Design a protein around this nucleic acid. Structure first.
Lengths: 133, 123, 112, 112, 29, 786, 56
RNA sequence: AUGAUGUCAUACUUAUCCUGUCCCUUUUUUUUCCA
């Protein structure tokens, strides 16, 4: 019975796997449609100068990235990525905002990991938990 | 199944078939090519690491050694005209493409060890 | 809701929103803030376990049903002592039944 | 692994809270618990070695707890294996609760 | 062992033999 | 002078380096022999097309990666504001939607991957810091019951500018420096000394002639801060014109007028440009810093100022060290800037103190309970003391409950987790008081506004190296006069503050030294001796010092560099000497890396080298998770020595894909790990220079231990039945408890550190063979001694 | 894992001893083990399924 | 007939001891054909 069940599990699994596979191929072909119509809706007065600026910045970007990749095998990876993580660095760069937290008078007023119920023993005086006076 | 249950070799080969298909559809996604992955004329070398001092003339000379060239096109920064430090070169034979490649790989011209690759250009 | 809005306001929940509701609720609110939240987040199935402890130890646990670290502390009997004293007569009515005055101790606040 | 081990060892200590007249064998168990509380990686190495290789164990003791209207059997296992079992217990209940083995009707649950 | 050819607890182990000089306590016992 | 012969030797070195690399290139092109039918081609042409296809797919989605990045990168600073037209707008929606389309078209594949491996697979017999939000829905799950203005920016900048203590002093001092080449500029904090002075000099036209203006700082991140604010004033991009260059971080381009750097960065610019020809101004900040590099650059630039008159030397500092400053720099005029924002009320204890820790405790107790609003800064010596302090304060917190209000105790030192360092920088929560227990690191480069009180125990952990025996002891020492002076001056920056000294006016005015021992005296100087031997100073005795070292320490230094072989039997540089000299680390490590080539343990020695670079802060050891940390540390403990333990930890971290939460889970400081990684790749960036070939020990830890042997043979100890005792000196050492062998106690041990804490100690030790010592140094280690 | 399953089920099969009587467990379950909660609740899960049916 | 050699435990001496391993401040350093 265990062999029979193992086989039936495996084959049902690959059945549904392939079905969902074809579902994703449909999804991505409609994404094909979406992308073609994206560039189509794209193709058809700060636009001229900001555009020369596009080619400006992107072109010296490709120049600097080319020659970075060239001088050191990847100093594009020595320069660009490592620039953008360390602490006092980010504090210096003015970067803004690089979960609930609350008052700490609350915490640690109580300490322990075991229930005070003695583990079933009863003969110890644990009725009140604050001295009388 | 059985597009997986044959090997690991051709499984990963079929994985390359897909990732190929998706990267193709992905370039057509971002809207570059009109026709979907026309297989490229094997008759051009994309030769990079080029020098901003080497122009279509000297490329034509040095790549005329191995075959009849059809043309020499260094893609231009349009409104500056200075070399992009890569190039395409267009032959007449596939035999010319391979005969130029298998000797011109990693070779020094103008104190730069340039690269030769076949043209994957769909342009 | 005060927590979510204190994320929205991104202010800090202060002791004033949580001292009216300090011993109320069933876990208990004073469990959120105990010392060992960090190694008690990994104790699962503790209720079944205290149930099955009856087949391992030769004694009977009258609180088989609960755990003080996980459930809070679900009773407080500190007014019982006070009102027991007021009903027996007060410390004076209570100590006239004793050998207190034969000790000549000046007053009963020092007894130990 | 150390959180699961700390929980196991605290649970095992909870028996001798009283620190009574106990015996030789509980003395020996407390010794094992303390030396595993000090050096928690020889402990865990032993534990996983056991879980991997051992399949013939020592003998268990039985005795009865007299509740005057029925009796309860109480089983007495040896210390080394009690530690291995306590850790296995914690690990199984933790994982079972994370993968959601038990549907919501199996009810001595930790939620109420 | 059979499964691998085809592929503590000290009660079970034999007894370490006697030394040349038996440690004093071994003798008084 | 000596500057010029140094220069001489340096340019000779540069041409020799160029020719050396050229010879290497031609050599290796010689060594690699470039040896470079119909159905043959008809067979392989399909296969070269296969690789063409595949590497083209990688390269193709790589250029899609390029423009993928580029669309959002360019549209960031153009679109959101400007009045632009049909074309580029259309292209914005295109790139937006189309990159989203690609993202979702790969997300589809990823989704199907994960949901198709999600399922049940019958078992097979075959022989981020939120566990207080994993414990906050457990309760809420248990407790549920259901059934232009940019012009305004610049005007504001200039308006505050006008209120600097140097802004009225503008033109008089500019003319002052126009007169005299050497200018002492004495000025206190906040004056604008670091920000406005280079702005002025930009305004003066000292930048024309293609010139630059150097501003050096003793600390990288302080350089970054100063640069950021000066660029903010400059209204430009920080990095093109106003730029900084420090280790691993270039933020300069060829527009650079104002180049900020560290003192070592300027030293290494003396590795590239001896006469500083493109810089018209070198502005050295807070030179009182007493840095090795500070007193090297002082002499070098003094010689430059003698040999380059139109060069501009401006060295500004905070304190009264201007006497000797001018004296060495031949009596420069001293331009006084008055800068001191707000008055500081400094109090003295009525008598001396006995247990100054409890005095600290009860002082902050009373200050908190009785004072009106305002933050608290309090100095202690360091980490152990500091957590004991916070222990005491939080104990009092617990005991006195709501009879007090919220006392956010915040400890701070250098090696504690960086998130918890950032912890203190939050603006104070209303109603609560913010009390920071600090080390003297918060004396300099940490400006936490709101501090209105500060208390000084009059002490500090000063290093003291008496070469006598090679003893480097971080000892307790009553703090300098200037030290306490600015420990007072750390306050007042926003309001009238107070500074309570734990000692009397008597002990202060009477028993106080002016300035801490100029480090050249106290420190061990191996790297700087090797460095001035790298520039070619043969006679290092009559060298232009400001404070000369004692002859003894340089004696033992030279004997050390000779012993490791960097000097010949008369004391000048070997080829090894110079190549090890370029490496910016002490020669111990550099010679061990030299040995890694011989033993074929390249990568391993690289990684160990990178590990000891930052080591002191690898492992976190919290008090609230002691046992989990001890165990996550005992996990890695491998046999052979803790150096290869560090090797293994880095191996496992890089194994993870350089993950932070890896180090979080395994109780390792990410800062140290990350910096060790970048320093390792920097050593690999110099790796071809020093002629090192990349090979691995192939799991042969014998080679790696022997390379460590060749590197640290001086750093060895042997068993004696009265404890562990040195090999050479036979003075008694002890085993660091944090050592991976601390109780294994080898007979023959190698070490790396030498301190004498409460007991004499050595850190990060390894078990050695004494035979490898004769294998390595038979001329220094002979058999008779082992 | 088959390793833990084998441990857990090879552990219920032990010798049970009172003053001088000894026998071997071979059939039922020893509830004085520490994972006996898990065995009891999982087996009871199988029986919940028999009583309700997989659909309900 | 008594040698030294010993990793032998036991016996014994000195009104011979009750006399015990814990944990580091600050911080800077030039880089080279990509393909």
């Amino acid at each position: 019975a265990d062999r029979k069940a193992r086989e039936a599990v495996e084959m049902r699994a690959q059945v549904e796997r392939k079905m969902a596979q074809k579902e994703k191929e449909k999804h991505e072909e409609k994404l094909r449609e979406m992308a073609q119509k994206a560039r189509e809706r794209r193709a058809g007065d700060g636009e001229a100068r900001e555009r020369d600026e596009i080619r400006h910045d992107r072109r010296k970007e490709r120049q600097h990235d080319r020659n970075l990749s060239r001088a050191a095998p990847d100093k594009r990876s020595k320069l660009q990525r490592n620039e953008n993580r360390d602490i006092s660095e980010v504090i210096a760069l003015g970067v803004p905002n690089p979960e609930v937290q609350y008052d700490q008078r609350l915490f640690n007023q109580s300490k322990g990991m075991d229930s005070g119920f003695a583990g079933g023993e009863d003969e110890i005086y644990n009725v009140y938990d604050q001295a009388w006076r | 199944d059985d597009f997986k249950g044959r090997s690991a070799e051709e499984v990963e080969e079929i994985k390359a078939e897909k990732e190929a298909k998706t990267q193709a559809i992905l370039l057509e996604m971002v809207g570059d090519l009109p026709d979907a992955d026309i297989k490229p004329p094997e008759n051009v070398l994309f030769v990079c690491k080029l020098n901003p001092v080497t122009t279509d003339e000297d490329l034509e000379i040095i790549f005329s050694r191995f075959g009849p060239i059809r043309s020499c096109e260094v893609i231009r920064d349009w409104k500056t005209g200075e070399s992009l430090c890569y190039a395409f070169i267009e032959f007449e034979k596939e035999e010319d493409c391979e005969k130029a490649f298998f000797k011109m790989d990693n070779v020094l011209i103008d104190d730069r060890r340039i690269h030769v690759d076949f043209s994957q250009s769909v342009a | 809701l005060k927590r979510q809005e204190a994320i929205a306001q991104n202010r800090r929940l202060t002791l004033e929103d949580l001292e009216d509701s300090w011993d109320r609720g069933i876990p208990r609110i004073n469990t959120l803030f105990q010392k060992d939240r960090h190694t008690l987040a990994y104790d699962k199935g503790w209720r079944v376990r205290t149930d099955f402890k009856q087949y391992q130890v030769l004694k009977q646990n009258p609180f088989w049903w609960t755990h003080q670290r996980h459930d809070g502390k679900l009773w407080n009997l500190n007014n019982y002592r006070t009102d027991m004293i007021q009903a027996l007569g007060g410390v004076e009515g209570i100590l006239e039944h004793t050998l207190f005055k034969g000790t000549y101790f000046p007053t009963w606040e020092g007894l130990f | 692994d150390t959180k699961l081990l700390i929980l196991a060892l605290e649970r095992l200590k909870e028996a001798y809270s009283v620190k009574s007249r106990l015996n030789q064998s509980q003395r020996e168990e407390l010794g094992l618990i303390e030396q595993a509380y000090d050096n928690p990686h020889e402990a865990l190495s032993r534990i996983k070695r056991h879980l991997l290789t051992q399949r013939a164990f020592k003998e268990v003791g039985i005795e009865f707890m007299d509740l005057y209207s029925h009796l309860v059997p109480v089983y007495d296992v040896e210390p080394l294996e009690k530690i291995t079992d306590a850790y296995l217990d914690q690990y199984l209940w933790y994982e079972a609760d994370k993968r959601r083995l038990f549907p919501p009707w199996i009810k001595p649950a930790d939620t109420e | 062992f059979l499964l691998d050819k085809a592929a503590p607890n000290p009660e079970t182990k034999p007894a370490r033999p006697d030394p040349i000089d038996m440690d004093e306590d071994e003798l008084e016992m | 002078d000596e500057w010029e012969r140094t220069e001489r030797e340096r340019l000779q070195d540069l041409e020799e380096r160029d020719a050396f690399a050229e010879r290497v290139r031609q050599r290796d092109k010689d060594r690699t022999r470039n040896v470079l039918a119909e159905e043959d081609r008809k067979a392989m042409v399909p296969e070269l097309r296969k690789k063409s296809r595949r590497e083209y797919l990688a390269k193709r989605e790589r250029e899609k990666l390029e423009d993928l990045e580029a669309e959002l990168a360019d549209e960031e600073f153009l679109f959101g504001d400007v009045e632009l037209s049909r074309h580029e707008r259309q292209e914005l929606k295109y790139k937006r939607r189309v990159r989203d389309l690609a993202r979702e078209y790969r997300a589809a594949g990823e989704q199907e991957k994960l949901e198709a491996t999600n399922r049940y697979h019958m078992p097979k017999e075959t022989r981020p810091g939120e566990e207080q939000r994993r414990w906050e829905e457990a309760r809420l799950g248990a407790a549920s019951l259901k059934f232009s203005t940019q012009a305004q920016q610049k005007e504001s900048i200039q308006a505050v500018r006008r209120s600097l203590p140097v802004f009225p002093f503008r033109e008089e001092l500019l003319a002052a420096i126009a007169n005299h080449q050497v200018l002492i500029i004495e000025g206190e904090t906040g004056s604008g000394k670091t920000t406005q002075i280079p702005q002025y000099l930009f305004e003066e036209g000292y930048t024309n002639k293609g010139m630059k203006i150097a501003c050096t700082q003793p600390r990288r991140v302080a350089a970054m801060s100063v640069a950021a604010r000066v660029a903010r004033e400059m209204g430009v991009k920080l990095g093109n014109e106003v730029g900084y260059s420090i280790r691993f971080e270039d933020c300069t381009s060829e527009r650079t007028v104002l180049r900020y750097m560290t003192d070592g960065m300027l030293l290494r610019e003396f590795l590239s440009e001896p006469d500083l020809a493109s810089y018209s101004v070198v502005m050295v900040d807070e030179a009182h810093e007493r840095t090795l590099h500070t007193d090297i650059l002082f002499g070098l630039i003094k010689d430059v100022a003698r040999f380059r008159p139109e060069l501009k030397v401006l060295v500004a500092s905070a304190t009264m060290d201007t006497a000797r400053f001018s004296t060495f720099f031949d009596d420069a005029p001293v331009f006084r800037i008055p800068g001191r924002r707000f008055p500081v009320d400094i109090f003295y204890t009525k008598a001396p103190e006995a247990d100054y820790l409890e005095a600290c405790v009860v002082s902050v107790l009373q200050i908190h309970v009785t004072q009106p609003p305002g933050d608290i800064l309090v100095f202690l010596t360091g980490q152990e003391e500091i957590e004991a302090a916070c222990e005491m304060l939080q104990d009092r917190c617990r005991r006195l409950g709501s009879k007090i209000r919220e006392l956010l105790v915040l400890p701070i030192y250098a090696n504690l987790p960086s998130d918890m360092q950032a912890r203190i920088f939050q603006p104070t929560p209303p109603g609560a008081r913010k009390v920071v227990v600090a080390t003297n690191i918060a004396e300099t480069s940490l400006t936490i506004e709101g501090i209105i009180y500060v208390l000084d125990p009059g002490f500090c952990k000063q290093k003291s190296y008496n070469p006598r025996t090679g003893m480097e002891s971080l000892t307790v020492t009553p703090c300098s006069k200037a030290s306490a002076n600015q420990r007072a001056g750390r306050a007042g920056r926003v309001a009238a503050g107070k500074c309570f000294r734990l000692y009397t006016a008597w002990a202060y005015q009477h028993e106080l030294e002016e300035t801490t021992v100029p480090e050249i005296q106290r420190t061990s100087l191996g790297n700087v001796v090797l460095l001035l031997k790298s520039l070619g100073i043969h006679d290092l005795m009559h060298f232009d010092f400001l404070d000369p070292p004692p002859y003894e320490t340089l004696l033992l230094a030279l004997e050390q560099l000779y012993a490791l072989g960097a000097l010949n039997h008369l004391g000048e540089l070997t080829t090894s000497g110079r190549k090890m000299a370029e490496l910016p680390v002490d020669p111990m490590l550099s010679k061990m890396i030299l040995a890694s080539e011989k033993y074929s343990c390249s990568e391993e020695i690289l990684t160990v080298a990178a590990m000891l670079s930052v080591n002191n802060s690898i492992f976190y050891r919290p008090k609230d998770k002691v046992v989990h940390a001890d165990n996550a540390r005992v996990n890695f403990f491998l046999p052979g020595g803790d150096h290869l333990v560090l090797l293994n930890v880095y191996t496992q971290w890089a194994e993870s894909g350089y993950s932070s939460q890896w180090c979080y889970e395994n109780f390792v400081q990410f800062r140290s790990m990350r910096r060790a990684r970048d320093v390792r790749e920097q050593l690999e960036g110099l790796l071809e220079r020093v002629e090192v070939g990349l090979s691995s020990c192939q799991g042969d830890y014998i080679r790696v231990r022997k390379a460590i042997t060749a590197g640290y043979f001086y750093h060895t100890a042997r068993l004696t039945r009265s404890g562990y005792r040195t090999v050479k000196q036979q003075q008694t050492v002890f085993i660091h408890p944090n050592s991976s062998l601390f109780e294994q106690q080898p007979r023959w041990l190698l070490y790396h550190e030498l301190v004498l804490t409460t007991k004499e100690f050595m850190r990060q030790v390894l078990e050695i063979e004494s035979s490898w010592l004769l294998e390595v140094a038979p001329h220094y280690y002979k058999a008779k001694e082992l | 894992d088959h390793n833990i399953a084998d441990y857990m089920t090879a552990k219920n099969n032990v010798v049970i001893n009172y003053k001088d009587m000894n026998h071997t467990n071979s059939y039922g379950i020893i509830r004085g083990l520490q994972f006996a909660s898990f065995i009891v609740q999982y087996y009871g899960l199988v029986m919940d399924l028999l009583v309700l049916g997989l659909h309900r």
